[PDB]
């Protein structure tokens, strides 16, 4: 996952989970990428799936 | 199975919008963003209870899709959770609405605006959307937006969350009803 096109002002809520470095499961890439932006780039991808 | 319940494609999980039909043919409505590129729908994560197959998909620009039921035994409740739906109506500013999703359950609020345009990026632009103060989270796609016994819309998307609060946009259900010739029950 590439979060260059972020942030994005809105996200469709389809559920395809990812696991972040913060042990939080993000519902989909869009939610995931906007959080990575929100963290100013601090957040990463641990793996795909729920944490 | 009813509105607000989970639905599973090969790719992920959404929410059943409304149980509708034409003549003796039953379908279900959900988000176009869920129906795009999905063939079969299942009622459970295990992918054992088959629901039916995609008959139509309108996304982006709109955000509605339809699934022809192939499961003869599954009960197809014309409700949203326990809630009965008798008709459908058009959202109005200031209207009190309720959404039900498979991740979040039931959340209430009101219509803040009509005809909003929402850009999800990469040309995924949708238009003519109901704006509300209701929150929704991954998994909630395609859930029903109702007002008492009236069907109003289908969860398209938005921002924020149910903890901190948010903005959700819904696709008018009448447009979808009319496109396919179906009716709520």
Curated annotation (Swiss-Prot), chain A:
Domain notes for this protein: Avian ovomucoid consists of three homologous, tandem Kazal family inhibitory domains.
Cellular component, GO annotation: extracellular region
Domain annotation Kazal-like: ranges: 1-51
GO MF annotation: an example: serine-type endopeptidase inhibitor activity
Subcellular location: Secreted
Residues with glycosylation annotation: 40
Site feature: Reactive bond 3 for chymotrypsin, elastase, proteases A and B, and subtilisin: 13-14
Keywords, ordered alphabetically: Disulfide bond, Glycoprotein, Protease inhibitor, Repeat, Secreted, Serine protease inhibitor
Organism: Meleagris gallopavo
First-to-last residue of the parent protein present: 135 to 185 of 185
Identification of the protein by name: Ovomucoid
Bridged cysteine pairs (disulfide): 3-33, 11-30, 19-51
UniProt key word Glycoprotein: yes
UniProtKB/Swiss-Prot annotation, chain B:
Reaction(s) this enzyme catalyzes, per UniProt: Hydrolysis of proteins with trypsin-like specificity
A GO term for molecular function: serine-type endopeptidase activity
Cysteine disulfide links: 14-34, 135-162
Organism superkingdom: Bacteria
GO biological process terms on file: proteolysis
Assigned keywords, A-Z: Disulfide bond, Hydrolase, Protease, Serine protease, Signal, Zymogen
Record carries keyword Cell cycle: no
Enzyme class: hydrolase
Entry EC number(s): 3.4.21.81
Cellular component GO terms held in the UniProt record: extracellular region
Catalytic residue list: 33 (charge relay system), 63 (charge relay system), 141 (charge relay system)
UniProt similarity note: Belongs to the peptidase S1 family.
Summary of subunit composition and partner proteins: Monomer.
Function description: Has a primary specificity for large aliphatic or aromatic amino acids.
Protein name, entry field: Streptogrisin-B
Organism taxonomic ancestry: Bacteria, Bacillati, Actinomycetota, Actinomycetes, Kitasatosporales
Gene for this chain: sprB
Segment of the intact protein contained: 115 to 299 of 299
């Amino acid at each position: 996952v590439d979060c260059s096109e972020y942030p994005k002002p809105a996200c469709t809520p389809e559920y395809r989970p990812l696991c972040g470095s913060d042990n939080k499961t993000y519902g989909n890439k869009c939610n995931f990428c906007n959080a990575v932006v929100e963290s100013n780039g601090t957040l990463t991808l641990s793996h795909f799936g729920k944490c | 199975i009813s509105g607000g319940d989970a639905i599973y494609s090969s790719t992920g999980r959404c929410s059943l919008g409304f149980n509708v039909r034409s003549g003796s043919t039953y379908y279900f409505l959900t988000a176009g963003h869920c129906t795009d590129g999905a063939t079969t729908w299942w009622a459970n994560s295990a992918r054992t209870t088959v629901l039916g197959t995609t008959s139509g998909s309108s996304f982006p620009n709109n955000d509605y899709g339809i699934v022809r039921y192939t499961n003869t035994t599954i009960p197809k409740d014309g409700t949203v959770g326990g809630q009965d739906i008798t008709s459908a109506a058009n959202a109005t500013v200031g209207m009190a609405v309720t959404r039900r999703g498979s991740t979040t359950g039931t959340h209430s609020g009101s219509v803040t605006a009509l005809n909003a345009t929402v850009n999800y990026g990469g040309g995924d632009v949708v238009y003519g959307m109901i704006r509300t103060n209701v929150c929704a989270e991954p998994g909630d796609s395609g859930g029903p937006l109702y007002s008492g016994t009236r069907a109003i819309g289908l969860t398209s998307g938005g921002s924020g969350n149910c903890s901190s609060g948010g903005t959700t946009f819904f696709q008018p259900v009448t447009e979808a009803l009319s496109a396919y010739g179906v009716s709520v029950y």
